[PDB]
């Protein structure tokens, strides 16, 4: 039904919000510290000097284990 | 259809996986450091001296800003 299409779209959008903002291919699993923005996979987060969201200096990257992880 | 019920269940399970594993009421927004388990809201994470997943000592809690919030 049309209701099925609406639910498919909500699911797709939620799952797309879980992917890296830089490569769009791998799941987000890394946090820039101390700002806390958690928007990148480990590879893309590794060479950034400043946060791509708020421009704060990245002192270090903290790996995150999220219950939503499926890759 | 039956597919509408199947999609409703998938959406419910994904939304539940984004909720605090302790209180089941608020969104996950906190990481236990240094282990990295990110399974609690800020109120439950403030009250735990040990990680509820791996039992490692919590040295500090890091707030996380997730695009899904
Ligand atoms: Zn990436
Ligand atoms: Zn930031
Ligand atoms: Zn909680
Ligand atoms: Zn842990």
UniProtKB/Swiss-Prot annotation, chain A:
Q: What is this protein called?
A: E3 ubiquitin-protein ligase MYLIP
Q: What is the effect of changing residue 48 to E?
A: Inhibits LDLR degradation
- Could you tell me which residues belong to the region Critical for homodimerization? 64-66
Counting on the full-length protein, the chain here runs from 369 to 438 of 445
Tissue expression profile of the protein = Ubiquitously expressed.
State the compartments where it is located: Cytoplasm; Cell membrane
Its subunit composition reads: Homodimer. Interacts with the E2 ubiquitin-conjugating enzyme, UBE2D1 (via RING-type zinc finger). Interacts with myosin regulatory light chain (MRLC) and TMEM4.
Origin organism lineage: Eukaryota, Metazoa, Chordata, Craniata, Vertebrata
Zinc finger residue extent: RING-type: 20-55
Domain notes from UniProt: The RING domain mediates ubiquitination and the neurite outgrowth inhibitory activity.
Post-translation changes = Autoubiquitinated.
Explain the purpose of this protein.
E3 ubiquitin-protein ligase that mediates ubiquitination and subsequent proteasomal degradation of myosin regulatory light chain (MRLC), LDLR, VLDLR and LRP8. Activity depends on E2 enzymes of the UBE2D family. Proteasomal degradation of MRLC leads to inhibit neurite outgrowth in presence of NGF by counteracting the stabilization of MRLC by saposin-like protein (CNPY2/MSAP) and reducing CNPY2-stimulated neurite outgrowth. Acts as a sterol-dependent inhibitor of cellular cholesterol uptake by mediating ubiquitination and subsequent degradation of LDLR.
Q: What induces it?
A: Expression is directly activated by NR1H2 and NR1H3. Expression is not dependent of the sterol-response element-binding proteins (SREBPs). Expression is indirectly induced by LDL.
